[PDB]
Structure formats: C-alpha cells, structure tokens
Design an enzyme around this catalytic site. Sequence first.
Site, PDB file in Angstrom:
ATOM      1  N   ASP A  14       0.837  -1.180   0.000  1.00 32.27           N
ATOM      2  CA  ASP A  14       0.000   0.000   0.000  1.00 32.27           C
ATOM      3  C   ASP A  14       0.880   1.240   0.000  1.00 32.27           C
ATOM      4  OD1 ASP A  14      -2.245   1.480  -0.003  1.00 32.27           O
ATOM      5  OD2 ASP A  14      -2.825   1.077   2.065  1.00 32.27           O
ATOM      6  N   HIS A  31       2.272   3.605  -9.378  1.00 34.53           N
ATOM      7  CA  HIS A  31       2.158   2.171  -9.648  1.00 34.53           C
ATOM      8  C   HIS A  31       3.373   1.654 -10.395  1.00 34.53           C
ATOM      9  CE1 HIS A  31      -1.698   1.794  -7.857  1.00 34.53           C
ATOM     10  NE2 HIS A  31      -2.293   2.605  -8.717  1.00 34.53           N
ATOM     11  N   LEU A 107      13.178 -18.747  -5.294  1.00 29.16           N
ATOM     12  CA  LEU A 107      12.020 -18.219  -4.602  1.00 29.16           C
ATOM     13  C   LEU A 107      10.726 -18.616  -5.296  1.00 29.16           C
ATOM     14  CD1 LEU A 107      10.921 -15.961  -2.435  1.00 29.16           C
ATOM     15  CD2 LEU A 107      11.069 -14.440  -4.441  1.00 29.16           C
TER      16      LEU A 107
END
Lengths: 209, 207
Positions: A14, A31, A107
């Site tokens: 956020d 963004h 990962l």
Amino acid sequence: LPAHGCRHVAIIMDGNGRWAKKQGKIRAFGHKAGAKSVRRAVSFAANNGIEALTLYAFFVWALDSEVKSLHRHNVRLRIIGDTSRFNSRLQERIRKSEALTAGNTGLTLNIAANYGGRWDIVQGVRQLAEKVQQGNLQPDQIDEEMLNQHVCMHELAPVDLVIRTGGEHRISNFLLWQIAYAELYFTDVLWPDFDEQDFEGALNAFANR
Amino acid sequence: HGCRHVAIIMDGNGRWAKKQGKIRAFGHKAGAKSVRRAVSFAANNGIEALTLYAFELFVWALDSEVKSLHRHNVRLRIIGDTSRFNSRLQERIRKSEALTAGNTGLTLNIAANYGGRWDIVQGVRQLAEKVQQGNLQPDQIDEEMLNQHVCMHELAPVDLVIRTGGEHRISNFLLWQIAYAELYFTDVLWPDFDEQDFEGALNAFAN
C-alpha cells in the site's frame, strides 16, 4: 533455516497512490514506481533464503517482460486469486508464465490477482462440497487440517510474517486462513519507498519477536 | 466513534503477575477486574458488541456475574467448542445464555476454547451436510452463505481488534470476521488496560 527464521513473507503493498501524490505525480507513476519496488523485494527475498514471497496489490502487462526477468532469477511464479473472471487470452498468458517457471528452484513468488481471503476459503469449501456431492467425502470428516489442504498455498511453508506498508493497520481481506499464527508487521513507509533495509528491518523484527 | 463491534485478545495476565512479584492466579484475578472495566466501558459508550478472548475455570467466574449483566440488559453469549466442557458447566452456560438472550443492550461474546479456523470449519461442516442431503449445490456456496454460518453473523461486523500484551499476532482468534477490521496492538498488559487505553484504541479507529 536462514538466520532470520523466516520461510514465507506476505506483503500488502500500500502507498503507491499517496507516494505519487507527494511528488505532484498522477497515480500511474506511483504504480510504476511500485512495480520497481516489487522487483527490488523479489531480489531481496531470493537473496535472503526466503522460500516464498506473496504479494497483494491494495498486471495485465507486467506478466511477460517481468516473467523473463523472474525466470532468469530462478523464481517460480504462481498467481493466486479468482482468474476465471479474466479473458481467456491472457488467462493463457498466466498459465504459460506459470509452467515456464514451474521448474525453478529459487524463490516462489505468489502474486494475488482478484484475490480475497474469504474467496480463498470459499473456493476450498466448494471443492470439499464437490467431493461430498460425489460421495467421496463425509461431512464430519472435514476438519481444520483437511480445509487447510484446500486453501491457496497449502503446499508452501505457512506464512511466517505479514508486512503491510502504507500506514494502515488492517488485513483488507488479504490472507485470512493462512495468517492465523503469522507475525504482523506494519510500517508507514509507502510501498515505492520500501527497500532492502525496510525489508531487512521487518525480518529482524520477526526474528526478535 | 462509529465503532460498533470491538474484539479483544486479552494477553498479559501472567507477565503482569510476575512484574508484581505475585503468583499467576493473582494475575487472573486482576484480569477479571479488567474484564469488568472493559465491559462497563463498552456498554457506557454505546458499543453494540464486545468479543473477548482469553490468551473451564474462567467461564465459571462469569457465572456469578450473570445476574448483574442481565440487569444491565447485556446479552451474554459463549462462542467456541464447549462440547468439551463438563455437562454441568455446559448447562450453566446454556442457562445464562437463555436468561439474557432477549436483552437488547451490549452483546458480550466470551470466547471459550475458541479458534478462528475451528469456527470456519463448523460452518463448512454445516454446509457440507446440506450438500449431502441434496438441499444445497456446491456452486451455490458463496461468501454470503458461509458468512451466515460462522459465529456472530447476526451481529455488527467486527470494526476493531485490540490485542494487549505486546504480541503482534491474531493467534487463531477471529479470522473470517476480521477481514476489514482495524487492528490495534498495545504493549499494555491486560490487567492494566483501562478506559483510557480503550479510548486510545477507539481514537485510532476514528482515523
């Protein structure tokens, strides 16, 4: 087994909007900075022995140029969320990105797309209902452990740590079932500003707590 | 404040007793006083529901409180797996619930041998039985329907979760129910948590 003891981190990303607004920039700029910060976090996680990183944006493009990059970093990419709503032309691009990286041993990056924690529980419940209706499963055989193996990411390590950036103190219908025992870590850092030291600070809080 | 349903993870009784140089039961006794104080504050400030999580001996203590809660128009409910409990305690729970069930003031939910995952599972098992009887199709199961099968579905949604004692974890307390709740963590140990602490939490919610 890494020193910080953290196998699986989840993040509510956020702050992109107010980050942009702080610079007199429109939200799209935020963004974009946010996407950069994801790349940075993915690289950090992979380099710090984290088994799994799960990201929640609080994409239609990202999943292709990024995919080559992810793949080159030995990252296994999975998308969690309700992707049935999507068009089956980029639903195809999702499955292609997944199988392309399914072999990678580094990962595991889970990207939440049209994901909700309540939805997650409900799709797992629907699978149990299907088995009940097919006659396989008895209602009173259903316990926590069984439902546990039907929710997203049951095959990965339990979520150890949830990070929420951006100042708010809520889950916002992110993971619900999966965070029953997770450490929760809230920082005011806006997501684009969230960096290696912020991430390192989170892991150290987890280890100390 | 706009805060209709507060849930609290009451942690710290043990550590508190130690800091006081006293035994654990002394911490529990101070814990119960803090409960009384929290319940009165909630009712005093128009909070609709208060849901309390201790983190068979403890609910017994509330039996002697029931008379007073009833007079204060408090609706008392126990949430959690009481099937475990001895049948005498279960019947007293039953009686205290029934006595106050028609009350219209604060609803006070006491979590006893409760778990958030368990809570959801109970609803799942209920839906599963409806499926098995042909009374319900799998694809008809949605959020709204499962919501009506988990604890407290008939109360205002949980607005604020308070956890005392310094830990930053839900600890398999409410899970389904806190999807959109404000989460408030304080280092204050539960027997010290007072009206000002409680208001501090309400303030956080207010922004």
